[PDB]
Amino acid sequence: PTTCLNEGAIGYMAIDILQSQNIETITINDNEYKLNKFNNIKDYISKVWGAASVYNLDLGNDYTKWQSSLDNVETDNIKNYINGHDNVYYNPGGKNKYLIIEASKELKWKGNLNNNKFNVNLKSIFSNAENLKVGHSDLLKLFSSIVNSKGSDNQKKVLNSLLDNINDRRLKKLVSTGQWTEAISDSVANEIAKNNKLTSIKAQLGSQKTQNVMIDANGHDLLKIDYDKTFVTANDLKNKIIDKNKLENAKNYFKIQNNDKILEDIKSKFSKNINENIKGSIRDHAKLIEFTENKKFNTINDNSNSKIKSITCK
Amino acid sequence: PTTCLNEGAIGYMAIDILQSQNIETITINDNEYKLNKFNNIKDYISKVWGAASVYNLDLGNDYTKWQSSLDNVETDNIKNYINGHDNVYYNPGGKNKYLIIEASKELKWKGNLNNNKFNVNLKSIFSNAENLKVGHSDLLKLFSSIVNSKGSDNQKKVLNSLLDNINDRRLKKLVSTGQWTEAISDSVANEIAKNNKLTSIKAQLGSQKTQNVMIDANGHDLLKIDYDKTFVTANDLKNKIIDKNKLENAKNYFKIQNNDKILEDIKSKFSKNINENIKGSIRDHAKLIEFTENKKFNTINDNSNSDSKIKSITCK
Ligand SMILES: [Cl-]
Ligand SMILES: [Cl-]
């Protein structure tokens, strides 16, 4: 919701260059994909953005302002989303699971949209994408690479600012949600935890599988707390039996550490130290941050020849 | 089948060391595991080895000779297995699949055993193993680390030799089946193929799902071949409609390259360059090769030290 038009601008930027040079197909792996043709920005945005119908922004050729337009419309939702996190459950011994940190307030977007609708379908740039076996991040990497290769010097300056913008919000959301621990190596995670006075526990975020989470215990002994007395339990939430005092506790006992010091701390070591065994919703996020941070672009070749112009990638 | 007793000996040496020092538990991932107790070599092998009953070997305290014992029983099977590979199927255009390389001859082991039975079950060293979620290779590394940390010099010299034995055969088998490509990074895989005159195709090995395979095309143009005329088809081979000349063709057109040149080439670059995206039976095979080659042991600490009601050590 906060990096989508940043991505969209990069996708348009490549299309603007390719169409400008009469290039109609791209070679991904060993297949040829035929690019769609777009009249203007409104045409492209209408095609690749889910939420295009709802907002009706007016976007110029200043791509650094594309996200800002959305940012100004939704205002507080933008910062609140980036800093937001889910409900946190802790299983101290057995058999029950307790809500130790409550989720951030629910955000209502324009049109009562859903987080999926803000996605930009980089596959809609191709007419025959249905045959494509590439994920969103690599496609973003693909279009970003085209702008670096064929873009002007000023265009590359814009691409870099856009990539940088994606990294900042994407990483921050990852730290703020507590999901950063699962996305880097155990050794580095513990170093940052040691350095930042965080406590490592085994916890569940929303409906996700249990994972490694690091929380700020706020000068508390997690051994000494009575979870039955203090907190509500996940099965209790289902029964809609809720003790307000116990629910109130989830607000005040612990927090997820997202201040600038851990944020800087992780960013220095995040890029190098991604987990060997990772997959899922989280992996795309990790793929994205790594590329936008390091900026290792793919290579683009021009296919040479009554021509149809084309280019290849890996 | 060819490195199993090499692995078993490493496990016994650790048990021998730990028991010699009255140590009953190991700490793996903030957990405590209780070691089983073994009277002798036959007691341990009978418990951790699937095939112990079948062979009934007599194993001495020269552990480097443990594998040699099994090797003499099975003889030709050892070399044939290490160099063996499965059926290779190629889908040239669209809907049909052809046998382009025939599998090696069927091997019959003693008792007509199955390759799973040759496994050394390193969790059977612990009584409370069922909550343990650690793979075979990581366990071997754990026991190897114990032999390095607490073992005598003679024992450490044996361990180095045993590890070396495991590396050589496991890697050669990985090279011989054509599966090495899936266990390393694409660029390095492409590099070795280029240096070794290999052709990269998309192929299926046995009943496995499709993957990337590199074959020696023996100076052949895979574009110019008529697979329908030349080769049998996976459906045909399965149903036993077989053309004698076509099956013969699968013997002679291409080969899987496992000679020393490529073997050395892969051995130099394999350990550093394991594939980011890897899993299956193949991944454990890769971890094992990586560890035995590099030989970077874990750290073994005595927490409770020489004097305690229960003696223990920790790891990871
Ligand atoms: Cl986002
Ligand atoms: Cl083997």
Automatic annotation (TrEMBL), chain A:
Q: What is this protein called?
A: Uncharacterized protein
Top-level taxon of the source organism: Eukaryota
Q: Which UniProt keywords apply?
A: Plasmid, Signal
From TrEMBL, chain B:
This protein's UniProt keywords: Plasmid, Signal
Q: Does the keyword Signal apply?
A: yes
Highest taxon of the lineage:
Eukaryota
- What is the official name of this protein in its record? Uncharacterized protein
Name its species. Millerozyma acaciae
